[PDB]
Amino acid sequence: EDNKQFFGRHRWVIYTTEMNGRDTFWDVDGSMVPPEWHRWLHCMTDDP
Amino acid sequence: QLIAVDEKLDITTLTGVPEEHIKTRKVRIFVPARNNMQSGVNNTKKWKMEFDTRERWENPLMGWSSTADPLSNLVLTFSTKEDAVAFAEKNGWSFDVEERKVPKPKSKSYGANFSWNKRTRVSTK
Amino acid sequence: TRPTIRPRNDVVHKQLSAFGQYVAEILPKYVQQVQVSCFNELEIFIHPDGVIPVLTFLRDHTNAQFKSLADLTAVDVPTRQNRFEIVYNLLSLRFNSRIRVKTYTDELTPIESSVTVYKAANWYEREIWDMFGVFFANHPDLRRILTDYGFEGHPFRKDFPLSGYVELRYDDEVKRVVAEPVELAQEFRKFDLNSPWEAFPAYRQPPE
Amino acid sequence: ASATRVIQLLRNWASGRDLQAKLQLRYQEISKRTQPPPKLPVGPSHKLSNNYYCTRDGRREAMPPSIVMSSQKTEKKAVTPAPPIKRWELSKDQPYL
Amino acid sequence: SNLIEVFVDGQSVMVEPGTTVLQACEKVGMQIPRFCYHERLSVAGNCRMCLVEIEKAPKVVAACAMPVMKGWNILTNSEKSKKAREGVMEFLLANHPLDCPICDQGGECDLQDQSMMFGSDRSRFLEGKRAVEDKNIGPLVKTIMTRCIQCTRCIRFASEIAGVDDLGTTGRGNDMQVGTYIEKMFMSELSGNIIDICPVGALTSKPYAFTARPWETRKTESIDVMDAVG
Amino acid sequence: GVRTSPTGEKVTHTGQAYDDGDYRRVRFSDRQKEVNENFAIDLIAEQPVSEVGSRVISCDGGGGALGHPRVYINLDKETKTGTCGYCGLQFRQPHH
Amino acid sequence: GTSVKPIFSRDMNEAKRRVRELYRAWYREVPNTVHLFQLDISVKQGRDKVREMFMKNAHVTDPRVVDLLVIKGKMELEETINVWKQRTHIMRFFHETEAPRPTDFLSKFYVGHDP
Amino acid sequence: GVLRLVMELSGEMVRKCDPHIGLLHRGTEKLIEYKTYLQALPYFDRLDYVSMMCNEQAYSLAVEKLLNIQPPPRAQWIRVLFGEITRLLNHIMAVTTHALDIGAMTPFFWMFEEREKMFEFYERVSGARMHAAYIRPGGVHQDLPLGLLDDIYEFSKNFSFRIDELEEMLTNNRIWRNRTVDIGVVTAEDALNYGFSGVMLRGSGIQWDLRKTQPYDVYDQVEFDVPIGSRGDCYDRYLCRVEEMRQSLRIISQCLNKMPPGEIKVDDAKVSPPKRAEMKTSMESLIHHFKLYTEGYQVPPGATYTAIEAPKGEFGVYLVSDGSSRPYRCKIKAPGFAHLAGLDKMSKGHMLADVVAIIGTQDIVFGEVDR
Amino acid sequence: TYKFVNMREPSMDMKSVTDRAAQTLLWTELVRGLGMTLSYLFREPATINYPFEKGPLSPRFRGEHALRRYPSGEERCIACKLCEAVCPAQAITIEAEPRADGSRRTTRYDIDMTKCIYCGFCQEACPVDAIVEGPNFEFSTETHEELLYNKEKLLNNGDKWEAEIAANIQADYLYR
Amino acid sequence: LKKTTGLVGLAVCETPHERLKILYTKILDVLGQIPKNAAYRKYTEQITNEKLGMVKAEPDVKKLEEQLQGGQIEEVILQAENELSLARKMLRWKPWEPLVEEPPANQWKWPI
Numbered sequence A: 001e002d003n004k005q006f007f008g009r010h011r012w013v014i015y016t017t018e019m020n021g022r023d024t025f026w027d028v029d030g031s032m033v034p035p036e037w038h039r040w041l042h043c044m045t046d047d048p
Numbered sequence B: 001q002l003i004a005v006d007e008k009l010d011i012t013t014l015t016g017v018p019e020e021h022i023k024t025r026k027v028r029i030f031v032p033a034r035n036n037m038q039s040g041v042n043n044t045k046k047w048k049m050e051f052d053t054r055e056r057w058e059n060p061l062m063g064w065s066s067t068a069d070p071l072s073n074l075v076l077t078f079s080t081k082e083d084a085v086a087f088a089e090k091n092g093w094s095f096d097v098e099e100r101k102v103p104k105p106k107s108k109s110y111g112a113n114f115s116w117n118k119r120t121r122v123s124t125k
Numbered sequence C: 001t002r003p004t005i006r007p008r009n010d011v012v013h014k015q016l017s018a019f020g021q022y023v024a025e026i027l028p029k030y031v032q033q034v035q036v037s038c039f040n041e042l043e044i045f046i047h048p049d050g051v052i053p054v055l056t057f058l059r060d061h062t063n064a065q066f067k068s069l070a071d072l073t074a075v076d077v078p079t080r081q082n083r084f085e086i087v088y089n090l091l092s093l094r095f096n097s098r099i100r101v102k103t104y105t106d107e108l109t110p111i112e113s114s115v116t117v118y119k120a121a122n123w124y125e126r127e128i129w130d131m132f133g134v135f136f137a138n139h140p141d142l143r144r145i146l147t148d149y150g151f152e153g154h155p156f157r158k159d160f161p162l163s164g165y166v167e168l169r170y171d172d173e174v175k176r177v178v179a180e181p182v183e184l185a186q187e188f189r190k191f192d193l194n195s196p197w198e199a200f201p202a203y204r205q206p207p208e
Numbered sequence D: 001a002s003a004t005r006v007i008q009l010l011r012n013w014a015s016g017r018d019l020q021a022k023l024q025l026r027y028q029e030i031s032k033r034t035q036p037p038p039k040l041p042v043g044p045s046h047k048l049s050n051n052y053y054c055t056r057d058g059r060r061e062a063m064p065p066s067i068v069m070s071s072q073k074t075e076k077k078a079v080t081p082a083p084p085i086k087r088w089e090l091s092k093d094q095p096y097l
Numbered sequence E: 001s002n003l004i005e006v007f008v009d010g011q012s013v014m015v016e017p018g019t020t021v022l023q024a025c026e027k028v029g030m031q032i033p034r035f036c037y038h039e040r041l042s043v044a045g046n047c048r049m050c051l052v053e054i055e056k057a058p059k060v061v062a063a064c065a066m067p068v069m070k071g072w073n074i075l076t077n078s079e080k081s082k083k084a085r086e087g088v089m090e091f092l093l094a095n096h097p098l099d100c101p102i103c104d105q106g107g108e109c110d111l112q113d114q115s116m117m118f119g120s121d122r123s124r125f126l127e128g129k130r131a132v133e134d135k136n137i138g139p140l141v142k143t144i145m146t147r148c149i150q151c152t153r154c155i156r157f158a159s160e161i162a163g164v165d166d167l168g169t170t171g172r173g174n175d176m177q178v179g180t181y182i183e184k185m186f187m188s189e190l191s192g193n194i195i196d197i198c199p200v201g202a203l204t205s206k207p208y209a210f211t212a213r214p215w216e217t218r219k220t221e222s223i224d225v226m227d228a229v230g
Numbered sequence F: 001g002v003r004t005s006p007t008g009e010k011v012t013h014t015g016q017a018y019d020d021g022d023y024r025r026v027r028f029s030d031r032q033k034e035v036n037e038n039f040a041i042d043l044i045a046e047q048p049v050s051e052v053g054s055r056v057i058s059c060d061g062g063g064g065a066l067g068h069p070r071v072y073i074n075l076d077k078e079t080k081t082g083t084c085g086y087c088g089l090q091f092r093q094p095h096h
Numbered sequence G: 001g002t003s004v005k006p007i008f009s010r011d012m013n014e015a016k017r018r019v020r021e022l023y024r025a026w027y028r029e030v031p032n033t034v035h036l037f038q039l040d041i042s043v044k045q046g047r048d049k050v051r052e053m054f055m056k057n058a059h060v061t062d063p064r065v066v067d068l069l070v071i072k073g074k075m076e077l078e079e080t081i082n083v084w085k086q087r088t089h090i091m092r093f094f095h096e097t098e099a100p101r102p103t104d105f106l107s108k109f110y111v112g113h114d115p
Numbered sequence H: 001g002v003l004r005l006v007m008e009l010s011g012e013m014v015r016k017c018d019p020h021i022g023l024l025h026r027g028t029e030k031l032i033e034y035k036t037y038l039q040a041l042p043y044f045d046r047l048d049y050v051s052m053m054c055n056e057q058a059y060s061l062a063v064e065k066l067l068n069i070q071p072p073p074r075a076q077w078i079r080v081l082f083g084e085i086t087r088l089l090n091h092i093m094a095v096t097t098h099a100l101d102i103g104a105m106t107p108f109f110w111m112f113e114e115r116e117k118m119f120e121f122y123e124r125v126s127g128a129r130m131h132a133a134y135i136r137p138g139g140v141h142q143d144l145p146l147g148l149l150d151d152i153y154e155f156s157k158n159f160s161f162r163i164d165e166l167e168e169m170l171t172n173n174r175i176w177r178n179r180t181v182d183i184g185v186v187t188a189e190d191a192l193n194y195g196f197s198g199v200m201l202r203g204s205g206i207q208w209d210l211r212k213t214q215p216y217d218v219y220d221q222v223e224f225d226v227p228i229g230s231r232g233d234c235y236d237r238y239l240c241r242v243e244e245m246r247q248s249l250r251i252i253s254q255c256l257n258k259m260p261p262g263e264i265k266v267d268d269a270k271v272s273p274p275k276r277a278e279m280k281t282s283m284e285s286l287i288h289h290f291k292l293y294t295e296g297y298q299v300p301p302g303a304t305y306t307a308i309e310a311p312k313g314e315f316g317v318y319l320v321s322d323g324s325s326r327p328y329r330c331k332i333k334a335p336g337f338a339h340l341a342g343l344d345k346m347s348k349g350h351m352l353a354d355v356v357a358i359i360g361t362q363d364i365v366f367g368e369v370d371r
Numbered sequence I: 001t002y003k004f005v006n007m008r009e010p011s012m013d014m015k016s017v018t019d020r021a022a023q024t025l026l027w028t029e030l031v032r033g034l035g036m037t038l039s040y041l042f043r044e045p046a047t048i049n050y051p052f053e054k055g056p057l058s059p060r061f062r063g064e065h066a067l068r069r070y071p072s073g074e075e076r077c078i079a080c081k082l083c084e085a086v087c088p089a090q091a092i093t094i095e096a097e098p099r100a101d102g103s104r105r106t107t108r109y110d111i112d113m114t115k116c117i118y119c120g121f122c123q124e125a126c127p128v129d130a131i132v133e134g135p136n137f138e139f140s141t142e143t144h145e146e147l148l149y150n151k152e153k154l155l156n157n158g159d160k161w162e163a164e165i166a167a168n169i170q171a172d173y174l175y176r
Numbered sequence J: 001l002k003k004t005t006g007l008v009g010l011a012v013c014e015t016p017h018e019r020l021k022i023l024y025t026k027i028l029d030v031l032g033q034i035p036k037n038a039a040y041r042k043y044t045e046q047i048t049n050e051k052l053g054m055v056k057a058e059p060d061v062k063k064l065e066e067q068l069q070g071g072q073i074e075e076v077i078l079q080a081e082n083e084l085s086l087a088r089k090m091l092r093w094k095p096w097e098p099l100v101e102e103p104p105a106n107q108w109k110w111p112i
């Protein structure tokens, strides 16, 4: 997080390179975020 | 200014209905019966026109209920039996008409519950 | 009538009643009935022969002058001898008022086109012809406006099926879009929602 | 906005406006994404007593339209649909654009 | 002839002697609310949902049991009759369980529909409801007793139509319950009809349980072939 | 409580399994079959029966307005236990 | 009695001359329509289709219905001559993709419940 | 959107213009006859999919008039506030798309950023960015979240600079003026006869605004001016729409400062559903929730024509009820229908490229035209 | 009250005419538009770095559907069919029967994602909050068939998203 | 004299009193041929006589605008021409006559 950025760019995620069974060094997607961090990352709550 | 032609009305050639959905269907004109689960009679006031039931099969995927006739859900409402008959005749559909069923008047008496000599007397209330 | 009930306005009711009586007096040849609703809406029931006169009066009279046609539509009631009813909604900017004129017709009797009285009516009558099959006499160019080319029947009519009679797909053998009889994968579910135990005693009908 | 002073002056001059007062990008000023629970006041009909529904039934006070001159059944001053509409006033806040 | 004149909402109607207020209202086209009255059963008068105002009379009468008198002007949509209907509906719903989603008589409930058309839109009952234990009367009629409103339609049908005196009321007042008082199956060739006459989900069909909602069903009029009665 | 069909498919909580001669299993080749591993019947069977010293007990599923409608259960019948019509929880009076 | 308002005609003779007039226009148009839409059909079988469509409505004995059908036919002519329709709209008259539905009793008995 | 247009041109000039419509005819009016009133509400979001809550408001007003009830004051204030926000959205869409078709293409992005912010407002209030279904025929569905008014105020105190930038790009540009001035001139009598409404009237000097002459929710409690044109060309209508955006900002300010407390739907459980807690605790509330979400409410028989001053013009509905819980007839009157009908006369003696400008200034969306 | 938008009259003195001629010949307003664009270039853009950054949402947001269950682990659905009745698009199909323990449970609960309009009427009609429209929106598919959900798929979605769904319901249930 | 009435296509009519008087006189002349008992004749004669009295009793044009309750004398002239055209067309129409025919027994019965 970085609260000095404008709303929308103040939170971000760096994806892992190896999720359940695939190499995710390049092939990242938004479905890889677990529900709790999904709620935090989409600004549905202020609490991680 | 007036033709004054004498002939029964027939609009089948103008409605766009396919031929096999005119001469083959059999409509029913009736007053719907009262649902015996309830005692209300507001649903037995008008006349209804409905078509005959056709094949309904099971969808190979997800097992939904598939049909092939367009007139499965078509139900029309009329004020009188004559209006429905006229509509069916002018639209070229063969029809079966059923006379309206009316619950006959009944003789109700509370005191008859507590009868002196008759069988009507109730054992409990 | 505490806050949840819509307030009434008797001044507008009186004004609309008086104006309805006025219009009824001036045109007794065509005007068959005049009504004012409980929410202050004036509708005038006329003969089919009086479409061109009455509308013209309502457009041109100094007292009425309804110069704008808000909407022209049709309603289908299969139980009536005259199947379709034609509804004209007019707005008067000079007096800040609205009026409604109702007419009747059946499948074969044409209704006089009111394109001369209102330019706005031309598309409206095209849509009425497309969806209900009501022919309008002396229309500049009466043809389908919303349905597909070559479409058979009128969709808005009560008898017409919700999903129609034909459906479209693409065929590779003929390499084009073709039409076949409708075959739904899942049939539309019909719900019987009307309850017994009538809701509104004020609209109860005689038992005949 | 993390903009240098010279770039701020350049954009202010080229636009002709002071941009920093009204930035189009949202910052800290917006409301927090987590809020306290509300309470929400109840309606007028909630009263325990003297609240019979027949006294507050709007649908049951609707009636069929009044019929005047059913054709099946004096000076006489002329009348209009409603009183003539008054002309508008010329917006004594900025009448001309 | 022997017909007497009575007025329903100021409208004259000619009726036979002994005709009830409810039937006089029927002849003009109105259906009086009811839960315990049935045409085929004997009059009970227990529910009090048929209470209507007779003009120039201070007390409301039970329309299902009171014979109409000559010159009476019934006031069916009067304020007094509406208030009586709301009060009776409130009393009926005070102890009723919040079982509508799990009740097999969701869209076919006379209680629900008459609440919608003649009752109030809210409750002022701040107490706890009661619960009675269910009874077992065989494999055909599923009994969920808390829902029952003590109309006594089932008892009257069993005693008069089915000819079986197995059903009765036990206890007194609020705790009075409809049943058999012993583990005993009410089994007869006419046993299923008590499901239809029961206005609530107290008596439901056991083979039909949980399968369909009434608004979904398509109704086909047909003829029975299980016997020669047709 | 997921079981296995004789042919080899997983039997769902509803109990539907394609029969050996059913062609419709061809849709599962090179793919999988969506089966939920948590069976609600077993999970509600694992719940202990609550002990209350009341003749009538109320249940709303827990959570207040986040549960089901509040219902009242009678506990007079000592042979069985009172069961909630919505949540499935069981209640019992302190016998002996 | 049964007095009814005219649309265009008063008797079946005016209706017949309108039908004939409409028919001639369609006949002239078919060769041109076939060429312009690059249809794989011949002019002969196109005109046979025209004949079949006109014969479909040959049992009408009412001038209002007849001249309303004439109005609809004139609307169709309009759509074709102005090229508002496409190849698919014209080929919808021939039903080249629909399987042939048998008419005899035994075949209908074998296929399904539909009479 | 999608439009087929058949025209005959003598050299450069357009002799005749004919629009062929029905490419987005989905049969909404027939489908409405198979739904309850609550079930039929979401169709109006789809009718004019640039101005959603205005259609919601028109339908809700029609159903309320037929039901003989009225919404609570807070619901009406919320309705007017979100209607003005919807007006801002629609006018941004119209002006930026007009410029994009003509060729400016920069204010399109400039103002769709603000459009994204307003979809954020919609989503926060309803959970849906553009088809919220928030305005119900008894009020609104849910109350505003606790931090929404502050964010609306913060947004609305910066929008005037965006309008000013748009004007810097457009109002004084000689190319834009040459493209729009003296194009599609319509006289007041012709506009009145052809059925035009909204800006298409006010561009010709006609002083008519439904929020002033026939106020409907609380519009008689807010103060704003009605921009009036003088030449009946595309430039006058563009200026009128910009001034309407400014007046919408004014109305939004007034609505923000005068939001009252109270409930959000009519306290009549036979029309508006009760609260979840009441449904889960009270027998009557549960019965009414069941019946309102299975059968719906019955509407007394009658026919009404309810019209509102929508962003595109007079948007109306002729609603016919037969006494059941399903509408018997629903006719939808969209201003785009009449405007496209008059396009033929509007584009007489003009260049081929002027038809694009006339279509843009008519503010045509084919969802409401075809229905 | 009404305003005039284009009711100004240009001055005809020599200075005004010379000013207008200078505007015509030297393209002053074109330079003003250029300056506006140039200034607007030197400000920070509004683009976010998707998928590493996400757009803001709300607890009320309507996404993918899910079937929830009680903390004990039994499903909340009681087969009342109110969601099916209210569904404006007829996207829900339900079949039910008594369970082996006598419970009132569904045997079929299908939602067609390609007929759904994502209005949320189903989740607000639900008496026991069995069906909810969760926060997921990134569930695009390569075939039409995988967008036809059955009961198992919806229960799996509920088990997958229950934490966030419960948090959102906790945040928003006091407005309902 | 004012310019640019504000309504596009509506030109300023200089010396409007004469135009109004001519239009009202022609309206009355057309109305005279209508049967005396017709309601349209007497109503339109009453309205036209009132308007002619006000225009003859007021030389000012703005005061005439305020008195006539139409405003913008040009559109009052336009309404006078529309009334004259309607009078001619409606003399041709003759609507003062009795209703042509009654509707079907239940033509206007709602519901059903």
Ligand SMILES: CCCCCCCC/C=C\CCCCCCCC(=O)O[C@H](COC(=O)CCCCCCC/C=C/CCCCCCCC)COP(=O)(O)OCCN
Pocket: H174, I024, I025, I026, I027, I030, I031, I034
């Ligand atoms: C004492 C001895 C001196 C001798 C006399 C010399 C004096 C010179 C005074 C006059 C010189 C001015 C000439 C410059 C060209 C003027 C042409 C012109 O004005 O035409 C315009 C047209 O101009 C345009 O519209 C062009 C706009 C095209 C868009 C380009 C954007 C402009 C900004 C880009 C920057 C320009 C950079 C220029 C330098 C380039 C260096 C290589 C008129 O069109 P309208 O206003 O529509 O009116 C016509 C109807 N009656």
Ligand code: SF4
Pocket: E096, E097, E098, E099, E100, E101, E103, E104, E105, E106, E107, E109, E110, E111, E112, E147, E199, E200, E201, E202, H287
């Ligand atoms: S009997 Fe009727 S009121 Fe009682 S729970 Fe069942 S549906 Fe609801």
Ligand code: SF4
Pocket: E147, E148, E149, E150, E151, E152, E153, E154, E155, E178, E197, E198, E199, E200, E202, E203
């Ligand atoms: S079980 Fe049903 S019929 Fe019998 S008394 Fe109870 S409510 Fe009445």
Ligand code: SF4
Pocket: I083, I086, I087, I088, I089, I090, I091, I092, I111, I115, I116, I117, I118, I119, I120, I121, I122, I123, I133
């Ligand atoms: S969100 Fe709306 S359309 Fe989708 S399943 Fe639920 S009720 Fe049906």
Ligand code: SF4
Pocket: I076, I077, I078, I079, I080, I081, I082, I083, I084, I094, I122, I125, I126, I127, I128, I129, I130, I131
């Ligand atoms: S409304 Fe809820 S409990 Fe009822 S069937 Fe739908 S998901 Fe199940």
Ligand code: FES
Pocket: E033, E034, E035, E036, E037, E044, E045, E046, E047, E048, E049, E050, E051, E062, E063, E064, E065
């Ligand atoms: S119906 Fe009369 S007391 Fe029950």
Ligand SMILES: [Mg+2]
Pocket: E105, E195, E196, E197, E198, E199, E200, E201, E202, E203, E204
């Ligand atoms: Mg029962």
Ligand SMILES: [Zn+2]
Pocket: F059, F060, F061, F068, F084, F085, F086, F087, F088, F089
């Ligand atoms: Zn429980």
